[PDB]
């Protein structure tokens, strides 16, 4: 009932993954709201239900497929389907609980987890922090398998949570940040797996604040600096929009554009 | 793997220069390419970058409207056209490969490859060759 974007890990290349993320971005935003050369996601307020979600179908070489559902308002994963079973993170209010009844409507075997999909919770359930969870094409292939096998009784919760952490970073965070897409491209290019460095983690943690600072900026300057980290962990402050233009590919809606 | 820069020199204020960054041993087509500059006693800084996707270009505020980056895939070369040069543009200029454009703000990537640099000096009066 929603647009679907397909990707496979089998034989994935820098190009196939790049083309995939581009398609995700193209379905998350209309392109009609662009500020400081950064697209803004749709405003949630009053957003019609047919416009609310997109579907991302992921397959691997073992012929397993899962379909993730992403909320267009924040690019984040809300649940998934494996065969004719569906699983949803705990929703935050009655409107969102109602919204997710419109996902995978041909699935009656539906379950809503008692937990949400935020990193703090998922790291607790996984027993590991993002800094110790490897990302790459291999991790993504394995995450697809683990999500699929939850539906057969074959994945326990820590592995499920780890697999969500992988998918959210490699799909949602890569769509949000061109820099993170680049970090995933490096892993594909060199056929390697590795945990995200501090630059990635701190960007992920800062997406909402960066979206605010950009949309509330005045003369391209932030009202208050945001502290980020370099790849070596060293800390630096950002005061202006321009240097973030290549880094950020999408922003959550915070306010109406200037008159 | 080599990245060779040429085109630097002494130019007058208001003048123009075109730098070249030519690759050997690999293809520039599938990387972002950035220009960076190091001026005396100053932090090394990203100047301009061109993506491997759809030719998207990015510029530091200080050079917007004066510098233009472009890529000639057939020649495995990237160029930096520098117009309306100012004394403040004097620096050693470097090109580097990256996966995506960052203007250097997160530091060097472990697999990024940098050239050895070309000096650009903006002054009306002669200087060291
Ligand atoms: Cl695979
Ligand atoms: Cl939409
Ligand atoms: Cl939102
Ligand atoms: Cl549960
Ligand atoms: Cl939670
Ligand atoms: Cl972490
Ligand atoms: Cl890596
Ligand atoms: Cl890029």
Author numbering:
A (entry chain A): 5 to 263
B (entry chain B): 2 to 130
From the paper:
A byproduct of castor beans (Ricinus communis), ricin toxin consists of two equal sized subunits, ricin toxin A subunit (RTA) and ricin toxin B subunit (RTB), that associate through electrostatic and covalent interactions. RTA catalyzes the hydrolysis of the N-glycosidic bond of a single adenine base within the sarcin–ricin loop (SRL) of the 28S rRNA, a conserved hairpin-like structure that interacts with eukaryotic elongation factors (EFs) 1 and 2, during ribosome translocation. In this study, we report the identification and characterization of 11 alpaca-derived single-domain antibodies (VHHs) that recognize distinct epitopes on the hydrophobic surface of RTA normally occluded by RTB.
The interface between V9B2 and RTA buries 1897 Å2 and consists of two hydrogen bonds and five salt bridges. The two hydrogen bonds form between the carbonyl oxygen atoms of Asp-31 in CDR1 and Arg-193 in RTA, along with the carbonyl oxygen atom from Phe-107 in CDR3 and Arg-235 of RTA. V9B2s CDR3 residue Phe-107 also forms a key π-stacking interaction between RTA residues Tyr-183 and Phe-240. This interaction mimics the π-stacking interaction that occurs between RTA residues Tyr-183 and Phe-240 with Phe-10 in the ribosomal P-stalk peptide (sequence SDDDMGFGLFD), as revealed in the RTA–P-stalk peptide crystal structure. Further similarities include V9B2 CDR3 residue Ile-106 that burrows into a hydrophobic patch on RTA lined by Val-242, Ile-247, and Leu-248, in a similar fashion to Leu-9 within the P-stalk peptide in complex with RTA. V9B2 and V9F9 each had a second less common disulfide bridge between CDR2 with CDR3: residues Cys-50 and Cys-102 in V9B2 and Cys-49 and Cys-105 in V9F9. As predicted, V9B2 was expressed at low levels, as compared with VHHs in families 1, 2, and 5.
